[PDB]
């Protein structure tokens, strides 16, 4: 029928989970620097 709505929702959730995790530990890296 159309747009991968629920699929783009899933790869969005993934994208927020990579940033939360990666940026969150990119902080922890400098704070022990």
């Amino acid at each position: 029928e159309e747009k991968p709505k629920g699929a783009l929702a899933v790869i969005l959730v993934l994208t927020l989970t990579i940033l939360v995790f990666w940026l969150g530990v990119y902080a922890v890296f400098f704070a022990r620097g």
Binding site: E1, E2, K3, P4, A7, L8, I11, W22, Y26, F29, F30, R32, G33
Partner: protein
């Protein structure tokens, strides 16, 4: 349907790869960033520095616990740490702050971890190889060293200490 979704699926796959590539390049840009700064001091020296592990704590700078530390620059100190079966010499390692400390770590037996709690100091120690790292704790107090590589039945008990002075 089925074949009106295929082209759109192939279309939004194309932008994902474009976007995801970019975000990795963003990441390669921030890792390189950290490599250009001071915190980059923690990356183990690239050059090979072989030792005999059968003769490390009897001859050379490691042999003596009182000889562990040595002033090598104006504000640069070199500590000769030895990580062994369930412990570290010297204990405790004593070091001043605002000061750059060049750890030189090896082992006489097996592979041990060297994880200084509260810092980025995390390095594997290989018998017959010296791990060379650069760090400066802006923080004064009680630094503890952990073995994070399985090194024997007493591995969970193998602790150490960096005594850093305010």
């Amino acid at each position: 349907d089925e074949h009106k979704a295929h082209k759109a699926i192939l279309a939004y796959e194309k932008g994902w790869l474009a976007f995801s590539l970019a975000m990795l390049f963003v990441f390669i840009a921030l890792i390189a960033y950290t490599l250009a700064t001071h915190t980059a001091g923690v990356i183990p020296a690239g050059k090979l520095e072989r030792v005999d592990p059968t003769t490390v704590r009897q001859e050379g700078p490691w042999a003596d616990p009182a000889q562990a530390v040595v002033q090598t620059g104006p504000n640069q100190y070199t500590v000769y740490v030895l990580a062994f079966a369930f412990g570290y010499q010297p204990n405790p390692i004593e070091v001043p702050q605002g000061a750059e400390i060049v750890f030189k770590i090896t082992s006489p037996d097996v592979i041990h971890g060297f994880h200084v709690e509260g810092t980025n100091i995390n390095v594997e120690v290989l018998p017959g190889e010296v791990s060379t790292v650069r760090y400066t704790f802006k923080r004064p107090g009680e630094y503890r060293i952990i073995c994070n590589q399985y090194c024997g039945l007493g591995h969970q008990n193998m602790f150490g200490t960096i005594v850093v002075k305010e």
